Amino acid sequence: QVPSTMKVMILDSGDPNGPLSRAVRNQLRLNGVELLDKETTRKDVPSLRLGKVSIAKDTASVFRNGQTAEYQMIMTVNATVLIPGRDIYPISAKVFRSFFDEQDMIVKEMYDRAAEQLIRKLPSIRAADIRSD
Template structure:
């Protein structure tokens, strides 16, 4: 009876975690060639570079500075971050009541002897505009943008792990031999 209850509880637990969309993203295996990366950016202390650097460290990826141009280590080149706002709904007096904020981050992953791979991550959120609380509105918007940046960076990390795996496990046959 005890084994049946344990099996039933374990089955419900597994069904519940899979059914609600819970996934353990931090339990991914980092390939050996990705354990050390170079982070190329024009603004090393900007919010995007700092968020990416912290996320890489959380995934146990060591980030180094490029001292010479001929280092044969994979690198990530931050290109740009775009944030756009679109009106979703309008009050009766013509003021916007709800926005859709979209953040798109463009990077390039450079894998030595394999190539340059462009990677893009896009995250969208809705934001309610409070016309009588401008200070709270600005603070709330900056928190939302910071949260979106963290989500986009996590998405980028998963994308360039897939890109690294694909680049190292595919071969292109140029000639019939």
């Protein structure tokens, strides 16, 4: 499903060995994407830049009467895909878990979901890129 124009790609991130980068790397490999270093001499290789990762925890107390407590975790990822010489495309992922409230394994799993959401945006970018002529 990854467009053919994106089967070779650069992954640009501030921490290539962090959990988000690994999760995105992992999904790109699973989809048959060859990842190049940023200093490649190849031409026109698109880049996926991981710009921002945010993790928010919300604790809410609701008066019913009697009270109820609810916990949310929200993971938001903002990234950009650059098609050299053409355009830059912002994409994002948002992953939501709510509870009854281990934490670290939940987050690990959220990163995989965030990575799948990003990769699923690539077709819409190629569609726009084709129509821009």
